[PDB]
């Protein structure tokens, strides 16, 4: 049930703002950072929404005007799409899959250009959609630097230390239009996902649902993303998607969602909820040291077999036929 | 067409002595050792029957009486079966496949005990079948030692040297009853197969017919053997067996068949042809150093993936499910 905003400002959102899908879900726990149960969940690599970390407290005042004024003159990657779905793709892998035609295009622009573009669409009632996705770097201006330094490093540094994680590799700034969707995928880093403006519905699936989510081949540009179109699932090609069960939550300003490494996640900015802003914190996982093997360890194994086969065969497109030759009439 | 024995002793064998199968074949060339074409075939890892190597000339006089009298008091492995098919199995892998029940059993006995057993079956009109399969070692007696030293080492040592092969690992002595069959399999060593007594029909298939022959899983005891029952092929489980095409020949005393490493081979002692005797020469292949990859190199790759997965998963029975999880809805 949608939470009530403090001061009787009513429900933060309602059901009609959520897209409709074919599978059931259960709630991700929302807990205080001081609650032992929260620590237990993170330690066990299970998702949890933390409501009071103050992780990005200083960023809570951020909006397009403040960011335009203060984030510098560096380039920002902005994706443009004709659909609500911003399927991630790795440009470096496009050469090996000449027939992949991306539904979104990346354009590099200045922040004020992004803002102007957003304005032109609104005014001209356009259907175009934008999604800025840019790692925070040294070109940000003074006030942003001050804000960033005011993040709760004390709390997150202890988390990093407590879980044996590796280094912070980056902080991705995500600014999306209402209705934008990042289709289901998994990332190979640990993630504290800090919501700043607007609301995003996050649907997560544990690594043991690999068989239901059908990620692209490792050498395909959409490596790590699900092949299933959540809006029109093809059960003939992906029969186990009929067995998928998600963990879901809606995060708003001040909330931090822990998205454990290898956990699938689908993220959508609420319909009619205005623009959203998020900053993530990506950390490399702990070191690979016992049986029985965890699901995510089997996923790592599968990725490695795919990688080695591609290298040994000298052409990634030969991977499938060899794998098929290996299993038919022998293991299937 | 069956060859004519010198001295007008008539056809060495006839069609009625060959078992009937579902696939076509083409002949393996029969050539003189001095024929450049023979060298070309061996160099290219293609089968050839050599008719005049004199490789085991001194063994041509061998028969059960002479061997019983001279081969020593060492133990011989003798397989016993209720069927004509002597499917090879690796006893060390039986623990991991508790449900595999071998159709043949190994018994260790003295040569004279083997001979006596053969006699008892004949006399009692029994249906039991025996197949002695024993590596030649230091317990053989003086005359056998003399015979062995009289093999054409000059010719085979040059072959070994010319092809860059590794060491001779062993010489297997095979003594079978008429009608005995060694079902289709491939070996990971180079083989000069020297026929001594009786006739054996050899059907070979190139490594690129892997998809048609369906070898057992690597960790199964029947690793390297085909799962297809040539006498009653199950096309539902093994549909590409409908596409298999063999290379065949019948070898007799004095003939040497080169069976190149990784080439599938099915070997049968002619029906009603009396006992057969063969001595093979197994050599380790040359060293693994260019694209495109050869079929046998892809076979090596597949074996390696199976091996690594078994070790990484810690249970070979987990190999299949992981492989299936890898390919369904992703590569198939």
């Amino acid at each position: 049930e949608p939470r009530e905003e403090a001061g009787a400002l009513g429900p933060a959102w309602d059901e009609s703002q959520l897209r409709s899908y074919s599978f059931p879900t259960r709630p991700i726990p929302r807990l205080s950072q001081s609650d032992p149960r929260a620590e237990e969940l993170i330690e066990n690599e299970e998702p949890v929404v933390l409501t009071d970390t103050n992780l990005v407290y200083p960023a809570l005042k951020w909006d397009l005007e403040y960011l335009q004024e203060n984030i510098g003159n560096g380039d920002f990657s902005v994706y443009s799409a004709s659909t609500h779905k911003f399927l991630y793709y790795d440009e470096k892998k496009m050469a090996n899959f000449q027939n992949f035609k991306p539904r979104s295009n990346r354009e590099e622009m200045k922040f004020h250009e992004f803002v102007e573009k957003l304005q032109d669409i609104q005014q001209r009632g356009g259907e175009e959609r934008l999604y800025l996705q840019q790692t925070l770097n040294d070109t940000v201006g003074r006030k942003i630097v001050m804000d960033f330094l005011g993040f709760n490093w004390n709390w997150i540094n202890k988390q990093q230390g407590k879980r044996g994680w590796g280094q912070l590799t980056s902080n991705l700034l995500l600014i999306g239009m209402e209705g934008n969707v990042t289709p289901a995928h998994y990332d190979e880093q640990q993630n504290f996902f800090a919501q700043i403006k607007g609301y995003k519905r996050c649907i997560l699936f544990p690594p043991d649902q690999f068989e239901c989510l059908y990620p692209y081949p490792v050498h395909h540009p959409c490596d790590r993303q699900s092949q299933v179109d959540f809006d029109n699932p093809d059960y003939e090609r992906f029969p186990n998607f009929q067995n998928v069960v998600g963990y879901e939550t809606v995060v708003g300003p001040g909330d931090v969602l822990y998205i454990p490494m290898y956990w699938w996640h689908h993220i959508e900015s609420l319909l009619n909820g205005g623009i959203t802003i998020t900053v993530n914190f990506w950390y490399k996982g702990a070191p690979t040291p016992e049986y029985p093997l965890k699901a995510h360890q089997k996923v790592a194994i599968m990725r490695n077999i795919e990688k080695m086969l591609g290298e040994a065969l000298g052409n990634p497109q030969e991977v499938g036929p060899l794998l098929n030759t290996m299993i038919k009439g022998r293991y299937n | 067409e069956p060859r004519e024995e010198a001295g007008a002793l008539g056809p060495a064998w006839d069609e009625s002595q060959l078992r009937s199968y579902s696939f076509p074949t083409r002949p393996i060339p029969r050539l003189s050792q001095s024929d450049p074409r023979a060298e070309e075939l061996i160099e290219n890892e293609e089968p050839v029957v050599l008719t005049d190597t004199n490789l085991v000339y001194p063994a041509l006089k061998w028969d059960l009486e002479y061997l019983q009298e001279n081969i020593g008091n060492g133990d011989f492995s003798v397989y016993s079966a209720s069927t004509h098919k002597f499917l090879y199995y690796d006893e060390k892998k039986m623990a991991n496949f508790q449900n595999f029940k071998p159709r043949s059993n190994r018994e260790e006995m003295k040569f004279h005990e083997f001979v006596e057993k053969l006699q008892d079956i004949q006399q009692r009109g029994g249906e039991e079948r025996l197949y002695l399969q024993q590596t030649l070692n230091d317990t053989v007696g003086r005359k056998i030692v003399m015979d062995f030293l009289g093999f054409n080492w000059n010719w085979i040592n040059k072959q070994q040297g010319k092809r860059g092969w590794g060491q001779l690992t062993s010489n297997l002595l095979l003594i079978g009853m008429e009608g005995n069959v060694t079902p289709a399999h491939y070996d990971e060593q180079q083989n000069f197969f020297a026929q001594i007594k009786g006739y054996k029909r050899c059907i070979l298939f190139p490594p690129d017919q892997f998809e048609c022959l369906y070898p057992y899983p690597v960790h199964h005891p029947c690793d390297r053997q085909s799962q297809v029952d040539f006498d009653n092929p199950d096309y539902e489980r093994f549909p590409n067996f409908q596409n298999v095409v063999g290379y065949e020949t019948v070898v007799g005393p004095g003939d040497v068949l080169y069976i190149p490493m990784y080439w599938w081979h099915h070997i049968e002692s002619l029906l009603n042809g009396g006992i057969t005797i063969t001595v093979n020469f197994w050599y380790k292949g040359a060293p693994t150093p260019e694209y495109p990859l050869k079929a046998h190199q892809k076979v090596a790759i597949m074996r390696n993936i199976e091996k690594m997965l078994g070790e990484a998963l810690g249970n070979p029975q987990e190999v299949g499910p992981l492989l299936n999880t890898m390919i369904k809805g992703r590569y198939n």
Partner: peptide, 24 residues
Amino acid sequence: LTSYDCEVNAPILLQGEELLRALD
């Protein structure tokens, strides 16, 4: 075989740990 990389939905200017230290 169990080893893993660190790929995410973003390409591989200081950032992450490097950005933070430079700033502090």
